[PDB]
């Protein structure tokens, strides 16, 4: 179970995801990949905003689902 986080530059990354975890841990995992701060990550999938607090299975993110990641304009 892995996803594809596509940054606005077009470069995508692969990272292990638990099928029943929440967004907080997988958002903090991006810090171990590119050093992105969790407070200002704002990942997007299927046109939704995917705010923290809810699990990933709520948005029905299956395997190899390409997500997005826009950063607030203060550090982009």
């Amino acid at each position: 179970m892995q996803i594809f986080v596509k940054t606005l530059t077009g470069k995508t990354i692969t990272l292990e995801v638990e099928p029943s975890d929440t967004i907080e841990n997988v958002k903090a995992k991006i810090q171990d990949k590119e050093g992105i701060p969790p407070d200002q990550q704002r990942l997007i999938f299927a046109g939704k905003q995917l705010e923290d607090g809810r699990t990933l299975s709520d948005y029905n993110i299956q395997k190899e689902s390409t997500l997005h990641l826009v950063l607030r304009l203060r550090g982009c």
């Binding site: 606005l8 704002r42 997007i44 299927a46 046109g47 939704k48 905003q49 997005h68 826009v70 950063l71 607030r72 304009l73 982009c76």
Partner: protein, 92 residues
């Protein structure tokens, strides 16, 4: 100075096709397509904002306009693209 979407249509081609060019006449057609489709959607949203007595062209009006003009699955794909884009825009 005349304006054209040539700089952009080349960028979109380098995305859809890394090794592919476009002749002057094809850029002139693709620019006319982007201007014609832009005019179609803008006029639809204009007629769509006047039907509801509105005065603001919102993302919803453009979404309905591209749902009206574009046929078949093309509209369902363009709506998703516009949605993905505006979500990344307003989230920054």
């Amino acid at each position: 100075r005349k304006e054209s979407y040539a700089i952009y249509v080349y960028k979109v081609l380098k995305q859809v096709h890394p090794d592919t060019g476009i002749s002057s006449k094809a850029m002139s057609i693709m620019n006319s397509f982007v201007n014609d489709v832009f005019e179609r959607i803008a006029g639809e949203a204009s007629r769509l904002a006047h039907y509801n007595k509105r005065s603001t062209i919102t993302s919803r009006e453009i979404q309905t306009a591209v749902r009206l003009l574009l046929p078949g699955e093309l509209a369902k794909h363009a709506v998703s693209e516009g949605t993905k884009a505006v979500t990344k825009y307003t989230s920054a």
